[PDB]
Amino acid sequence: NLEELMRTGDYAQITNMLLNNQPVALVGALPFITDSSVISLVAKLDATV
């Protein structure tokens, strides 16, 4: 839960999962970028955010 992560300030679990490439689901109202570029998909820019 991104709200709980924001409120606690403890980023140990999220940091450990992102460093170790552990599949996760971040839940919360999020703005998103609509990308229509196929080259962006090939470049895998969605995994760099």
Binding site: T8, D10, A12, Q13, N16, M17, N20, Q22, P23
Partner: protein, 396 residues
């Protein structure tokens, strides 16, 4: 093993300390250790079972960390923690059961289950913390080749054996001299009998000797000596040595004479007790030598003299007993005892899931056969399963 023990102890501390209304300061270190365990275990896939009737179970860890409270824990915190604790406890119990049912002739001290083998990896060493139980302490010492010590109340050191030896006998079994003994658990009960009551023995003394070779060295042992062996003080019909015939025993009990208990280590006399009964201390020994004598009473009342004629037939047979009871001791190796449940736990787990007989332990984990042939490989495997059994006992 250390990581599995640490998981179990973290879960035990979580169950004991994470209780409603407790100050967060009473659990701060415990909560940090628990969250470290959650971080280390998350994302790891484990499998247990697949042996006998133990079901195959797959374990996944996708738990969030335990939170914090300003002053005291509330009910919500306890329930949220208890869900995770329950899952982890189920996992730990299953891992312990998987490890307890396995054995190896080669490297019997090493983990045998896939889950415990995975838990021995470097990544999980983070979970390791306080190792204060007796079994885990001895495990760590043994891994370092340090002197181990297990304290047993009434150690199960003597394999069951009810046997006799006839030093003088003949096919009619009416004039017999010998010894009959029971070595069961932590108890020795020996009795030397002479049918002629040492009428023709030199100086009217008949010497009886019993030797018990302990399969492991016992140290700091408290032992109770009693003059009489009640188990062999009543008349009984005993099979022959070859089972062809039965003979008759009709004890009349006399005080054992010149009693001598020698506790020996590697053939060297360590402790000697002469005509001493009650509590004695055997500091370090692997052999017990009980030497006693039937001394014919030089003076007898008419009733007593009636029982012991100058010649045959002998109807009342003079018996001198001796009872030895190891109340407590210390052994460098693991043994069954009346105070612990490790053997019972391992045997129960093996019986419940119908584990086929392996190449290390005897069928059914029978203690008599196990202690009779207590090989170093058997010792390693039994220490491993006993340590896992204690780890499981922390939670189950």
């Amino acid at each position: 093993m250390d990581v599995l023990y640490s998981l179990s102890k973290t879960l035990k501390d979580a169950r004991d300390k994470i209780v409603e209304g407790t100050l967060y300061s009473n659990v701060s270190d415990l909560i940090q250790q628990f969250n470290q365990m959650i971080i280390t275990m998350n994302g790891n896939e484990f499998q247990t079972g697949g042996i006998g009737n133990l079901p195959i179970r797959n374990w996944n860890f996708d738990f969030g960390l335990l939170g914090t409270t300003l002053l005291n824990l509330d009910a919500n915190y306890v329930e949220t923690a208890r869900n995770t604790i329950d899952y982890f406890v189920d996992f730990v119990d299953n891992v312990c059961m998987d490890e307890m049912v396995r054995e190896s002739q080669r490297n019997g001290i090493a983990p045998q289950s896939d889950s415990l083998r995975k838990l021995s990896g470097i990544k999980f060493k983070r979970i390791n913390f306080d190792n204060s139980s007796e079994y885990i302490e001895n495990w760590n010492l043994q891994n370092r080749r340090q002197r181990t010590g297990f304290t047993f109340h009434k150690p199960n050191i003597f394999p069951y054996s009810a046997s006799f030896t006839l030093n003088r006998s003949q096919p009619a079994h009416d004039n017999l001299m010998g010894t009959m003994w029971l070595n069961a658990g932590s108890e020795i009960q020996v009795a030397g009998f002479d049918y002629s009551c040492a009428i023709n023995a030199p100086a009217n003394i008949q010497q009886f000797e019993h030797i018990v070779q302990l399969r492991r060295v016992l140290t700091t042992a408290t032992i109770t000596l009693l003059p009489d062996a009640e188990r062999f003080s009543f008349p009984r019909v005993i099979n022959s040595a070859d089972g062809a015939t039965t003979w008759y025993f009709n004890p009349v009990i006399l005080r054992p004479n010149n009693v001598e208990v020698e506790f020996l280590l590697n053939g060297q006399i360590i402790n000697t007790y002469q005509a001493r009964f009650g509590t004695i201390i055997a500091r370090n020994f692997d052999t017990i030598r009980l030497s006693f004598q039937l001394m014919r009473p030089p003076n007898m009342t008419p009733a007593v003299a009636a029982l012991f004629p100058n010649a045959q037939p002998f109807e009342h047979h003079a018996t001198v007993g001796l009872t030895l009871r190891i109340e407590s001791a210390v052994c460098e190796s693991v043994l069954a005892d009346a105070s612990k449940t490790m053997l019972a736990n391992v045997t129960s787990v093996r019986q419940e899931y119908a584990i086929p007989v392996g190449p290390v332990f005897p069928p059914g984990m029978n203690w008599t056969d196990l202690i009779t042939n207590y090989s170093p490989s058997r010792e390693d495997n039994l220490q491993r399963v006993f340590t896992v059994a204690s780890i499981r006992s922390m939670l189950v």
